[PDB]
């Protein structure tokens, strides 16, 4: 029946929801109906409270992401790290009852292939380097000894960045950082990563972590027609083909939004298994009924 049900033995089937979706009675009934995992989407933490409570009273697993000033003043590494641990341990304590997994660090790696330094030169990095990741996981492991702790990134399937994610997560785990898991965001498209590209990403992440979530599943169209519903349906099937192949390491597959109406990609990107009216799509059937794709992966521009 529900997606969460069909896959009740491969992985949690999850969605990122904002406050409207668990506020709107009808969107909430769908979430309840389709998912056994909720990421707080919202990428004064009232929102994290509502999403958490929704999971609380409805017994849905919560993927901590939502919440996790603090560098505008150019703190010293030391002070930045106390602000980290504070926030991290605050965020984590308030929801360790519901949150089973945390995106402790997001998108620390750069997308630039032509970059000597594989980390995104984010403000956090410019202060601290590698060790803000280390600290972030140490702080979070400490605050909840428990929550699988996920390094979460996107374009996790392209050759270079993925190697960097792997290598960064390898050496940090090698150095003992509590990186329990790797979160493949899953912001794919209809031309997407190929099955082997996701296969080659998961099989690589497999070899250093016992947990891969798909945290932010999204399949934007064009990097509605018949061409479009099949391409969307087909790449979803392709993705869920490779995900249900790695069901062991993959504990959770979270779609990035309840529907195209909510999608960060915009509805014209037709990205999720529910159209803007939350009618399931042929993509939804293709995933539910574990179908294989019709056409092969479309060619790109």
């Amino acid at each position: 029946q529900g997606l969460k049900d069909i896959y009740k033995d491969y992985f949690l089937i999850g969605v990122a929801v904002n406050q409207r979706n668990v506020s709107n009675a009808e969107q909430a009934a769908l979430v309840k109906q389709e998912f056994n995992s909720i990421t707080c989407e919202n990428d004064n933490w009232e929102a994290a409270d509502r999403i958490a409570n929704f999971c609380r009273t409805n017994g849905i697993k919560l993927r901590g992401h939502c919440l996790m000033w603090m560098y505008s003043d150019n703190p010293t590494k030391e002070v930045f790290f106390q602000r980290m641990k504070n926030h991290i341990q605050a965020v984590v304590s308030r929801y360790k009852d519901v949150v089973y997994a945390w995106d402790v660090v997001n998108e620390a790696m750069t997308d630039d292939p032509k970059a000597e330094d594989p980390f995104r030169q984010s403000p956090l990095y410019k202060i601290a380097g590698d060790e803000f990741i280390a600290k972030a996981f140490q702080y979070a492991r400490e605050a909840d000894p428990n929550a699988l702790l996920f390094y979460n990134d996107y374009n996790e399937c392209d050759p270079v960045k993925s190697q960097r994610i792997y290598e960064m997560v390898k050496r940090m785990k090698e150095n003992g950082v509590p990186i329990d898991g790797i979160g493949m965001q899953g912001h794919y498209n209809i031309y997407g990563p190929t099955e082997a590209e996701i296969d080659a990403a998961i099989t690589k992440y497999k070899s250093i972590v016992k947990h891969i979530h798909v945290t932010e599943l999204d399949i934007r169209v064009n990097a509605v027609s018949d061409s479009v519903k099949q391409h969307l349906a087909d790449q979803y099937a392709r993705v869920f083909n490779v995900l249900r192949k790695h069901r062991d390491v993959i504990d959770c597959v979270t779609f990035w939004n309840l529907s195209d109406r909510d999608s960060w990609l915009g509805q014209n990107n037709y990205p999720l298994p529910f159209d803007a009216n939350y009618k399931p799509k042929m993509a939804y059937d293709y995933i539910k009924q574990m179908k294989a794709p019709a056409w092969p992966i479309p060619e790109k521009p």
Side-chain angles (χ1 to χ4, degrees):
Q1 208 143 315
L3 252 182
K4 144 203 75 78
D5 309 318
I6 301 322
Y7 290 89
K8 206 74 162 190
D9 292 307
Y10 301 78
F11 32 63
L12 304 165
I13 291 301
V15 67
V17 279
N18 51 70
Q19 310 143 252
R20 298 189 128 251
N21 313 114
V22 309
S23 272
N24 177 310
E26 290 97 7
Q27 288 154 35
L30 184 67
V31 172
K32 264 160 189 109
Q33 188 234 315
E34 220 65 69
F35 305 99
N36 51 21
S37 174
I38 284 160
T39 294
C40 190
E41 144 181 332
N42 311 47
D43 189 293
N44 292 1
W45 50 10
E46 284 190 337
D49 288 342
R50 317 184 221 283
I51 298 310
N53 295 323
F54 179 89
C55 305
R56 263 154 214 161
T57 65
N58 302 303
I60 307 183
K61 309 216 87 139
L62 179 60
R63 275 197 101 266
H65 173 89
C66 216
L67 270 150
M68 78 164 318
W69 259 257
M70 246 51 87
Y71 57 76
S72 60
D73 69 334
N74 301 283
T76 80
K77 202 172 70 184
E78 211 182 341
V79 173
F80 174 67
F81 282 0
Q82 259 149 50
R83 282 137 86 123
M84 267 205 161
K85 180 160 195 163
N86 284 332
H87 188 92
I88 290 203
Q89 275 184 166
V91 165
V92 169
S93 325
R94 195 185 180 103
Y95 314 92
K96 61 172 168 224
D97 50 299
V98 277
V99 169
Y100 69 105
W102 289 103
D103 297 328
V104 192
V105 182
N106 296 290
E107 314 165 8
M109 311 323 284
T110 182
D111 283 298
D112 189 333
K114 302 336 279 176
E116 46 281 85
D117 191 354
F119 291 89
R120 146 156 317 150
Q121 304 294 286
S122 75
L124 307 86
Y125 177 73
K126 286 191 287 154
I127 299 166
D130 306 342
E131 70 180 327
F132 89 76
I133 300 157
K135 301 282 146 168
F137 284 86
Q138 294 178 6
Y139 301 154
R141 169 66 90 231
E142 162 170 12
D144 191 351
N146 264 299
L148 293 169
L149 296 179
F150 275 76
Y151 173 67
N152 182 74
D153 224 321
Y154 69 95
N155 300 334
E156 66 281 11
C157 299
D158 85 293
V160 164
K161 180 165 196 191
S162 88
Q163 164 68 34
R164 287 147 161 201
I165 295 147
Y166 163 90
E167 190 207 345
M168 180 278 282
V169 171
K170 169 183 130 185
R171 47 183 278 264
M172 293 225 91
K173 287 210 92 171
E174 257 191 357
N175 290 9
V177 185
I179 303 175
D180 300 318
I182 284 188
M184 303 168 63
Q185 282 186 27
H187 299 299
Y188 297 165
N189 61 43
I190 58 188
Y191 324 83
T194 45
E195 296 194 63
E197 273 191 291
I198 295 127
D199 158 74
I202 303 183
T203 39
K204 184 201 290 209
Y205 302 148
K206 236 192 181 206
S207 81
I208 48 158
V209 290
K210 292 146 56 84
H211 304 265
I212 293 166
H213 288 160
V214 161
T215 44
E216 312 197 8
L217 189 53
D218 261 345
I219 304 193
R220 91 182 51 82
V221 173
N222 57 271
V224 277
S225 83
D226 256 21
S227 267
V228 167
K229 267 255 271 163
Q230 207 54 253
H231 288 322
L232 183 73
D234 278 355
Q235 180 66 354
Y236 263 121
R238 268 182 293 269
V239 165
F240 273 84
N241 222 39
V242 202
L243 295 197
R244 71 204 141 217
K245 166 183 167 170
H246 293 88
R247 35 193 302 187
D248 42 312
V249 59
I250 301 159
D251 314 303
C252 179
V253 181
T254 299
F255 301 99
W256 186 238
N257 273 114
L258 182 49
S259 65
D260 304 349
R261 198 165 102 95
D262 314 286
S263 168
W264 83 322
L265 299 162
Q267 333 191 353
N268 297 348
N269 268 310
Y270 204 61
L272 304 158
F274 297 83
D275 60 49
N277 307 293
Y278 308 76
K279 303 181 161 283
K281 267 135 88 170
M282 198 192 303
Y284 176 89
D285 311 337
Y286 264 52
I287 301 153
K288 176 133 139 202
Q289 299 163 309
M290 319 198 161
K291 296 185 168 314
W295 305 335
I297 196 145
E299 168 190 294
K300 92 103 181 161

